[PDB]
Design a protein around this ligand. Structure first.
Ligand SMILES: O=c1ccn([C@@H]2O[C@H](COP(=O)(O)OP(=O)(O)O)[C@@H](O)[C@H]2O)c(=O)[nH]1
Ligand SMILES: [Mn+2]
Length: 338
């Protein structure tokens, strides 16, 4: 079997037939894929709808004893059951192009990808990263492409890549768990490919867990079997994206003041796993934020964010278009900030 399509469900009764129909409609031999549904203890008739398809599909159907609260444990249970040469995770409210498995199979037989990104399309207003799907590419890296900007598991992974390297979703960390999963796949993959010929994938609490995942990602990058300068650059790119687009961006302007110490402490533990030499590699505006996160100093961290957002700085000059900023009295100057 080429493929195991892995589907975590939870009270998906109103929309699961869209996914199930798109899998039944695959222009691909039924003998060469299975559909692995693990249900997160739904209280509706999800399982009964799923059963209607057991003749159109090779279907494995499981259900957890109690709701795990997220797709991590369901997907892990399915991954242990998968016998496909490759796995594809599709969420219960999404669906795929009828030629997805056929095209992916042909691309894999031509290029032997270990991780294969497949172009996504947002429906009903949803987006959907795009900057890495402008072209089809048989081989990309973390440094010459934009793959680090999509870490959802809505991708194709060589089953043996995951299992031989013990790559599973963290079950006890309910936030951003797929970022660690896909980062680990990327870092262990001998070949990462991007297939963009058509739209294939149609897409529809405290921060302790969140920043533990981020810290595990930092440790994972730094420990990979890659050149040292390349690890540092990869970590810098991950930090660029994380501070620009994650919940970290602007948290000191949005989070209740009483809760920001808890944020800065958990963020600080993440950034403290980033060696300081890496700060020189990150976008300059983020350097004061890395500095005050490591020191776990929320007052100065918040002044930086507030200064950026209102254009006021305690002391600054401009040298060839870039600012040298002292954000508060007695604090270090940060130089060359765009
Ligand atoms: O307790 C839960 C809740 C969600 N899900 C599944 O995990 C995936 C999370 O997807 P969802 O579409 O709800 O997230 P979103 O679209 O908001 O990103 C879906 O396949 C759900 O069926 C789950 O397995 N357990
Ligand atoms: Mn969804």
């Amino acid at each position: 079997m080429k493929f195991s399509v892995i589907v975590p469900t939870y009270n998906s009764e109103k929309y699961i037939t869209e996914l199930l129909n798109s899998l039944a409609k695959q222009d691909f031999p039924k003998t060469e894929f299975e559909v692995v549904v693990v249900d997160d203890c739904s209280t509706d008739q999800t399982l009964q709808i799923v059963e209607k398809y057991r003749n159109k599909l090779n279907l494995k159907v499981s259900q957890l004893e109690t709701n795990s609260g997220g797709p991590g444990k369901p997907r892990n249970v399915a991954l242990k059951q998968a016998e496909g040469e490759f796995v594809l995770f599709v969420d219960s409210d999404d669906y795929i192009n009828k030629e997805t498995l056929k095209d992916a199979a042909a691309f894999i037989d031509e290029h032997h990808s270990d991780v294969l990104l497949i172009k996504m399309k947002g429906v009903n207003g949803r987006g959907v990263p795009q900057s890495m799907f402008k072209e089809t590419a048989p081989e990309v890296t973390l440094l010459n492409s934009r793959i680090i900007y999509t870490l959802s598991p809505t991708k194709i992974y060589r089953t043996a890549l995951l299992k031989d390297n013990d790559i599973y979703f963290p079950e006890e960390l309910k936030s951003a768990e797929d970022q660690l999963f896909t980062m680990k796949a990327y870092l262990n993959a001998n070949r990462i490919s991007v297939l963009s010929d058509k739209a294939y994938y149609y897409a529809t609490v405290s921060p302790e867990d969140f920043y533990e995942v981020m810290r595990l990602i930092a440790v994972e990058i730094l420990n990979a079997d890659l050149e040292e300068a390349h690890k540092d650059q990869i970590l810098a790119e991950f930090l660029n994206r994380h501070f620009s687009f994650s919940r970290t961006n602007g948290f000191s302007l949005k989070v209740k003041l009483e809760e920001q110490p808890q944020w800065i402490n958990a963020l600080g533990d993440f950034i403290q796993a980033v060696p300081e030499r890496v700060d020189a590699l990150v976008m300059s505006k983020l350097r004061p934020l890395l500095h005050y996160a490591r020191a776990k100093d929320i007052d100065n961290y918040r002044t930086v964010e507030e200064s950026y957002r209102q254009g006021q700085y305690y002391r600054f000059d401009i040298v060839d278009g870039k600012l040298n900023i002292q954000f508060n009295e007695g604090e270090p100057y940060f130089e060359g900030i765009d």
